[PDB]
């Protein structure tokens, strides 16, 4: 049940990061 | 520059969505 949440939190961070980068860089 | 942010926020919200599901459902 958490194996998904781990991967869910995984992609959540990667997309937010790329969003952050795209705004200022 | 603008469209780069959109597609990122796009991907951001989806990643965020999937994360909310894995926790509540």
**Number of distinct helices of chain A:** 1
Q: Tally of extended strands of chain A?
A: 0
Assembly type of the chains comes to homodimer
State the major sheet of chain A. none
List SSEs of chain A in N-to-C order. Answer: H
Structural class of chain A: mainly alpha
**Distance between the first and last residues' Cα of chain A:** 36 Å
The total number of structural domains of chain A is: 1
Instruction: Report strand % of chain A.
Output: under 5%
Question: Greatest chain-chain interface?
Answer: A-B, 13 and 14 residues
Question: How large is the radius of gyration of chain A?
Answer: 11 Å
PDB class: de novo protein
Keywords: transmembrane, transporter, de-novo designed, DE novo protein
Assembly: dimeric
Entry title: Crystal Structure of the Computationally Designed Transmembrane Metallotransporter in Octyl Glucoside
